[PDB]
Ligand binder design. Structure first.
Ligand code: HEM
Ligand SMILES: Oc1ccc(Br)cc1
Length: 137
């Protein structure tokens, strides 16, 4: 289930974080514009950049902590507010997050592992709800 999936992802955080982030950019290539240092670089070049691995991992660490603090896939409003108030997210809208979760769930369904994809979809939907309540446009 969802709790085991958090354990699976955490066990190999950096690899899942890179693979899912690249799945997101590959599905929605226009989103790369938010990451000006990743524009024009192959996946192997990205992997050679310290900040690529560091910041994928940090994104997914925070995502796992928000997931683990949720009850039945309903995140804390305080966690949604963290995400809204981060200066790094100041020009995003909930659609950016929706696309991220669509890509994440698609990756899970294509992986051939027994992720609880329906729960990640629902968690994403509930997180998007919470981001808009916390003021994201
Ligand atoms: C629930 C999903 C997300 C979580 C948990 C999250 C978390 C984070 C965290 C922890 C950082 C800081 C990383 C660091 O400084 O090392 C970060 C930075 C950033 N995030 Fe998010 N983020 C999420 C979704 C998104 C989405 C959808 C976008 C844009 C499409 C985005 C764009 C950015 C950008 C541009 C930065 C700063 C650039 C960078 O660190 O490379 N984030 N995010
Ligand atoms: O550097 C970053 C990698 C992945 C997301 Br999503 C945000 C920032």
């Amino acid at each position: 289930g969802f709790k085991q999936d958090i354990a699976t992802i955490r066990g190999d955080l950096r690899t899942y974080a890179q693979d899912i982030f690249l799945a997101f950019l590959n599905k929605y290539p226009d989103e790369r514009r938010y990451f000006k240092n990743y524009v024009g670089k192959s996946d192997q070049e990205l992997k050679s950049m310290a900040k690529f691995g560091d910041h994928t991992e940090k994104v997914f660490n925070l995502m796992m902590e928000v997931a683990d603090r949720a009850t039945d896939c309903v995140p804390l409003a305080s966690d949604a507010n963290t995400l809204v108030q981060m200066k790094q997210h100041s020009s995003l809208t909930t659609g950016n997050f929706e696309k991220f979760f669509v890509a994440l769930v698609e990756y899970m369904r294509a992986s051939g592992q027994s992720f609880d994809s329906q729960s990640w979809d629902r968690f994403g939907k509930n997180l998007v709800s919470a981001l808009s309540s916390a003021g994201m446009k």
